């Protein structure tokens, strides 16, 4: 049995009755200027009309194809510092015993990176697959690169994460990565990935990449326009 001395004291939170309870005022927080600036920058980029060469970067590889591309490219990460030291030690022993360094070291297969290097490989038509980060600032560093790949007949794909490409290339950030050639045990996987990119990304973004981006209205503007058009239809 409950104590009869216990009582309920409900609070009426109407206008002019009780002190208002502490609510979630997160929609109305006076934010710091850097947070406000980045949010309004994103909002303004949505509100203005985006030319197609910039708006094409909104179309990106999906989760499955990005995971398959990273599953292939994780086998071809560049040589680390300790591995390079061990290789140089083996080559030094080979020189000491009087052999060429090519007699002890094998031809490497790595993911090619660096923006100038990748652009040179695309111009020389040596790249087999190009992955371009979707968030490069300034955007002019990569805004020509889909058109360059289309001119050279190179399969390209826009992918989420310059940091994600940096994890491939042991860096914080990579703007673009390229595959030129792989080993014989991964040639089939590379060809299947290239065909998958061609059939599931490029053919789907062939028509959307030529359109303008942005032009979206805010929430209150959309609601005002809906009220206006229903008012006009009723009247």
């Amino acid at each position: 049995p409950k104590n009869p001395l216990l009582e309920k004291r409900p609070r009426n939170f109407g206008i002019g009755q009780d002190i208002q309870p502490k609510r979630n005022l997160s929609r109305m927080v006076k934010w710091p200027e850097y947070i406000r600036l980045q949010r309004q920058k994103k909002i303004l980029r949505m509100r203005l009309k985006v030319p197609p060469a910039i708006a094409q970067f909104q179309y990106t590889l999906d989760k499955n194809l990005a995971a398959q591309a990273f599953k292939l490219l994780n086998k071809y990460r560049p040589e680390t510092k300790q591995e390079k030291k061990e290789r140089l030690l083996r080559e030094a022993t080979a020189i000491k015993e009087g052999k060429k360094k090519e007699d002890v070291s094998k031809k490497p297969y790595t993911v090619k990176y660096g923006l100038n290097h990748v652009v040179g490989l695309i111009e020389n038509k040596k790249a087999s697959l190009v992955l371009i980060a979707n968030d490069v600032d300034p955007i002019e560093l990569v805004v020509f690169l889909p058109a360059l790949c289309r001119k050279m007949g190179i399969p390209y794909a826009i992918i989420k994460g310059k940091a994600r490409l940096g994890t491939l290339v042991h860096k914080k950030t990579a703007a673009v990565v390229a595959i030129t050639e792989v080993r014989s045990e991964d040639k089939n996987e590379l060809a299947k990935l290239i065909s998958a990119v061609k059939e599931g990304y490029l053919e789907k973004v062939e028509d959307t990449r030529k359109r303008w981006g942005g032009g979206i209205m805010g929430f209150k503007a959309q609601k005002r326009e809906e009220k206006r058009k229903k008012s006009l239809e009723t009247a």
């Binding site: 980029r45 060469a53 100038n116 560093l141 020509f144």
Partner: protein, 67 residues
Amino acid sequence: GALKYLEELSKKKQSDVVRFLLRVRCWEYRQLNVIHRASRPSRPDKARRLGYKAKQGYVIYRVRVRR
């Protein structure tokens, strides 16, 4: 390299892409301080040909002056 493409694109200041980028960057730099630090050059080809290097000891400061 890419910087040749950036040079030829930066020549075309009246194109749609460059015009949009200039508009949004003008808005952002107007909301920022009169003198503030840029974390990286917004025109890397121009900075590189004027002598900027990605080395500890090189800084970029963005400034606006009344015309």
